[PDB]
């Protein structure tokens, strides 16, 4: 009588502490290479922003008119999205973005700012609606009549909620000191801003800039977070774009940036810009910057793990 073990014609080569290429009865892949080219969203409340940029959902350009109060488990930014109609940018923009990505969306609230002694209705053709319009959550404050003075003003908003409030204002920079006075009258203009956390203040800075949508003025957007019960005040005298509504974070979400279609037919927790990674495997070689709940990125294309014994034939 003889006793032994099974074997096969064609086995699979693996690596060991000791040998490089040893055959085995069976082996299985340990590194995921298979990607699905869609954002798998089954069972998840998804918001694909398309032409609206994320920061846009706070200030309200026409792109973002349908997103001013959104609600998500999954937020998707697109390459084509813009935060902006009237040429400008956000100070501390990415941090703001990182905030909004995990916010679960936003709920708006009137701050109730009222106005005596100034105009209120500034608009432009970059921001089309029925006609020339502006940033839906913002207000473009002027001097009453085609020139003339801007009253040194104060406004305060008390956050009465249990959550941190997101406050956004804007500083206008006109194409000239000519344009600056025609809007808000002459002299140095100063906006100041304070909370408990916060302490800062701002001046406009007119001059020429490249034309972007045919306009050469820029709007500077800024922002801070009022804690509960803490209060914020705005000392200003012109060149100012007031916040009409403040923002409160809804809950919890995750944000990705991608260029593939949504698909409510597959489930996924690991995302990257060209798709969802669905895998049970401990590792992946698909995208080092995948986010969510993912196998670890590794450099190796492949690492075979033995699932059968050594293999020696006749």
């Amino acid at each position: 009588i003889c006793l032994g073990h099974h074997a096969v014609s064609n086995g699979t080569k693996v690596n060991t502490l000791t040998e490089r290429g040893v055959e085995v009865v069976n082996a299985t892949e340990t590194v995921e290479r298979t990607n699905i080219p869609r954002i798998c969203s089954k069972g998840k409340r998804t918001v694909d922003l398309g032409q609206c940029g994320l920061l846009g959902t706070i200030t309200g350009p026409p792109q973002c008119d349908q997103f001013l109060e959104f609600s998500a488990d999954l937020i998707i930014e697109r390459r084509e999205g813009s935060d902006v109609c009237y040429p400008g940018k956000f100070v501390n923009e990415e941090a703001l973005r990182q905030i909004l990505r995990e916010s679960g969306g936003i709920d708006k609230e009137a701050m109730g700012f009222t106005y005596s002694g100034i105009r209120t209705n500034g608009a432009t053709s970059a921001c089309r609606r029925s006609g020339s319009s502006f940033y839906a959550e913002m207000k473009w404050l002027l001097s009453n009549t085609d020139n003339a003075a801007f009253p040194q003003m104060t406004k305060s908003y008390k956050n009465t909620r249990k959550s941190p409030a997101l406050i956004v204002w804007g500083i206008h920079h006109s194409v000239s000191t000519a344009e600056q006075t025609k809007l808000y009258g002459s002299g140095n203009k100063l906006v100041t801003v304070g909370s408990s956390n916060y302490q800062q203040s701002f001046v406009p800075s007119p001059g020429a800039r490249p034309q972007v949508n045919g306009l050469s003025g820029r709007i500077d957007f800024h922002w801070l977070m009022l804690n509960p019960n803490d209060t914020v005040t705005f000392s200003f005298n012109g060149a100012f774009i007031a916040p009409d509504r403040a923002s409160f974070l809804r809950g919890k979400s995750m944000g990705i940036q991608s260029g593939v279609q949504v698909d409510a037919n597959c489930e996924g927790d690991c995302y990257h810009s060209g798709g969802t990674i669905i895998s049970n495997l401990p590792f992946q070689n698909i995208d080092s910057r995948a986010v969510g709940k993912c196998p670890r990125y590794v450099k190796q294309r492949s690492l075979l793990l033995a699932t059968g014994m050594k293999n020696v034939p006749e």
Partner: protein, 163 residues
Amino acid sequence: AGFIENGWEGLIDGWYGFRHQNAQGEGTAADYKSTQSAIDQITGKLNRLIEKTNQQFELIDNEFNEVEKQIGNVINWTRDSITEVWSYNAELLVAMENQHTIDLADSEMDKLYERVKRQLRENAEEDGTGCFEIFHKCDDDCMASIRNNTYDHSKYREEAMQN
């Protein structure tokens, strides 16, 4: 791969089998209880590694609009560092498990051998290639009893001692 100088491609029945050859005829049958123990153990490894984190990571970078270079560089430096580490962890883990998978397979053989050997008191002597020599023609009732660990170690003894 030494005294069982190869293996049986014909054994499609299980991982570990018997192959006897008395007068009565032929036979090849898997030993499921040794097959399973090994199988149960490869299974163990696979449940410790087909593994799911509950750790969300978010984005700290931006592919559409690049973050400031300095922070961008630290971020990339960190990511790269942490990639090097996991590529290391992955390769070592695979190598270490595969040695132990291998080494545990063979160890399941060598341990089956020596248990059959120990059933067969002095009624038999080790060949030198993982085969056993009977000095008394053993029929095929006697076989499945060598197999289902019953075979009597003194109730065939005397006869075989002589030979």
